[PDB]
Design a protein around this nucleic acid. Structure first.
Length: 54
DNA sequence: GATCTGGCCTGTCTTACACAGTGATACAGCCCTTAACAAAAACCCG
């Protein structure tokens, strides 16, 4: 949920207000994503689709 | 003295005889955050 959600919301969250380091940026953003599945499922669905396609 | 040579002189052609090591520059991995979803040999009582 949160992994695919961060890999999806990368553009705006990384080009609007990143933070101190890429580490802390993606950490806080993945936390917010996991605390949003209820609103991030299709990103994980696309991830699993690519995984099956591989 | 003509016509011969072998003696000598050139007159090419063959194989050897060092380019690897130096400072600076440039990229490619390779650890660092969460994070969740899937994955995983190992094994017990089943």
């Amino acid at each position: 949920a949160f992994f695919l959600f961060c890999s999806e919301y990368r553009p705006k969250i990384k080009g609007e207000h990143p933070g101190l380091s890429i580490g802390d940026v993606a950490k806080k953003l993945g936390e917010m994503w996991n605390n949003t599945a209820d609103d991030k499922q299709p990103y994980e669905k696309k991830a699993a689709k690519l995984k099956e396609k591989y």
